[PDB]
């Protein structure tokens with residue numbers, strides 16, 4: 295059995311720490327109870343000639359340890375000392391060094407405020423001093439990342455809430471998101487515009503060394519240009535990162551699988567599922583048995599694939615966006631290793647119903663029978679699967695809220711009420727479909743969504759201060775294209791409605807640098823309000839929300855901006871609750887399901903749960919609510935269809 299890659303045990307820490315010990319300050323110390331698992335395997339089974347440790351035979355003194363039944367190093371396939379093992383290597387613009395000299399080289403570079411590349415378990419990290427403004431602004435520049443929040447590694451978990459200290463210290467050692475008030479030492483460029491900071495603890499022996507001598511918080515971000523795959527080779531780090539890193543702290547141990555840090559909320563909610571959780575299987579729900587091997591390709595962004603067989607499913611690591619170049623290489627390598635570990639050969643492939651997805655291209659190359667699942671049906675079934683809803687459990691009403699996914703018959707959906715079970719998805723209602731002006735540009739420029747909402751729903755909209763930067767431009771050319779349907783497809787998107795509201799409040803840059811940026815901003819603004827009495831509503835008209843009444847009330851309710859943002863969240867939840875109540879009660883349904891990337895918004899769930907207390911409510915928890923949980927939803931729908939004999 296291979297278990298997930300795991301955080302250094304207290305025991306290995308104690309040995310690396312004790313003077314005169316053979317592995318004192320050795321940065322590759324591992325044992326039978328911690329260390330790289332999944333990341334160091336070239337093939338099955340889990341024995342040293344088929345790990346990366348074949349470049350290192352074991353010296354005489356690491357032969358009574360590995361061979362020893364009493365030792366906590368009995369069949370640690372990667373275990374080595376400084377005599378026989380990998381050793382650190384420092385590389386700089388006309389410098390070089392090795393071992394202890396290399397570790398000190400990096401420490402000194404970090405201390406002087408520089409960016410260093412450090413080889414971790416699952417890839418490389420870029421690090422600097424997280425207190426040092428100059429250094430953060432520069433890392434942002436070089437990595438191209440102008441706003442997306444940086445995770446930060448802390449020496450200890452002192453001063454954090456109990457719930458976070460608990461998660462931070464698990465063998466998985468994820469990044470945990472916590473209120474930024476708890477970490478005053480961070481410069482303001484770490485998570486600008488947001489209320490949460492992602493923190494982590496040292497989880498690998500090198501990280502423990504670095505932090506023990508640095509005793510300050512460090513940025514720890516992925517070793518790559520934004521929207522390019524993490525370099526995994528020393529060779530590729532040194533090439534890809536030359537203009538970013540001031541220095542390289544590398545090593546001659548190969549990494550064989552890309553494995554990003556996992557990200558959870560202090561609440562326990564899973565956001566990104568990789569290091570520490572993969573490659574654990576999950577049990578399929580009651581009634582799911584004897585399922586043939588099916589490969590589920592997942593979503594185009596935040597991608598994971600899934601392998602379904604028998605009574606279990608296994609999700610891959612976060613692979614990211616599949617429109618990136620070199621992501622297919624890492625994808626296929628992860629699939630190769632996962633199929634080899636599970637002796638898995640697919641007989642079927644399942645993929646998204648969207649014909650323009652990269653994933654749907656790869657499927658047709660496979661020579662297996664293929665089938666299609668609606669994006670929003672997959673989101674909803676993924677949530678039902680996590681809650682172990684039985685195969686014959688009965689219909690639910692689902693609310694699936696996201697940016698965009700392809701719906702029935704070509705429609706663009708992202709804010710829908712559905713009747714679902716594992717085989718069927720019937721669309722019932724939701725947000726009105728509104729144009730995306732300039733197609734792909736609508737997700738980058740929130741003001742385009744505000745314009746589209748105003749043209750549809752707001753009389754004399756040019757007279758509101760909220761619309762002033764749009765009204766001052768020559769907006770009629772784009773309005774003429776909208777009316778003619780030129781690159782302005784209709785979408786009932788919850789994510790785009792969030793962007794319209796954020797444009798109206800001015801809480802985001804006019805043009806965004808990352809996906810979901812305006813919505814995270816608006817949520818951060820609203821979360822600073824403790825709740826407010828307000829008159830803004832989103833009433834139900836038949837099976838849709840009445841956005842004209844929404845805009846007229848919301849635009850005319852002057853209040854501090856945090857209260858305006860809170861009112862929007864509240865009125866949105868109240869209107870969807872009203873819709874789901876009518877649909878579920880008149881069908882005899884007592885369970886409601888919530889899914890889609892928007893359902894990561896904590897204030898939205900809090901308000902939905904406040905207004906839907908008359909129902910049983912199923913929210914995602916152990917898998918991401920967004921696209922990273924999508925392959926699992928595809929796999930349970932495929933399975934249930936087969937189990938029914940269709």
Ligand SMILES: Nc1ncnc2c1ncn2[C@@H]1O[C@H](COP(=O)(O)OP(=O)(O)NP(=O)(O)O)[C@@H](O)[C@H]1O
Nearest residue numbers: 443444445485490491492515516519520521522557
């Ligand atoms: N305050 C925060 N709020 C939400 N998410 C956070 C926060 N801090 C860190 N994270 C997550 O930590 C992750 C690390 O890097 P990410 O930067 O997306 O992928 P990468 O492959 O490592 N590099 P890149 O491709 O540029 O993104 C991102 O998912 C962040 O969203």
Ligand SMILES: Nc1ncnc2c1ncn2[C@@H]1O[C@H](COP(=O)(O)OP(=O)(O)O)[C@@H](O)[C@H]1O
Nearest residue numbers: 696697698789810813817890891892895920921
């Ligand atoms: N806190 C939030 N509040 C509202 N919307 C959000 C929030 N976080 C993310 N989103 C939205 O959800 C989208 C991600 O949803 P997901 O289902 O993962 O992907 P997609 O929309 O690409 O199918 C983001 O682009 C953004 O539109």
Ligand SMILES: [Mg+2]
Nearest residue numbers: 452453476477
């Ligand atoms: Mg503190």
Ligand SMILES: [Zn+2]
Nearest residue numbers: 303306325328
């Ligand atoms: Zn150990």
Ligand SMILES: [Zn+2]
Nearest residue numbers: 353356375378
């Ligand atoms: Zn040795």
Ligand SMILES: [Zn+2]
Nearest residue numbers: 696699891921
């Ligand atoms: Zn989605």
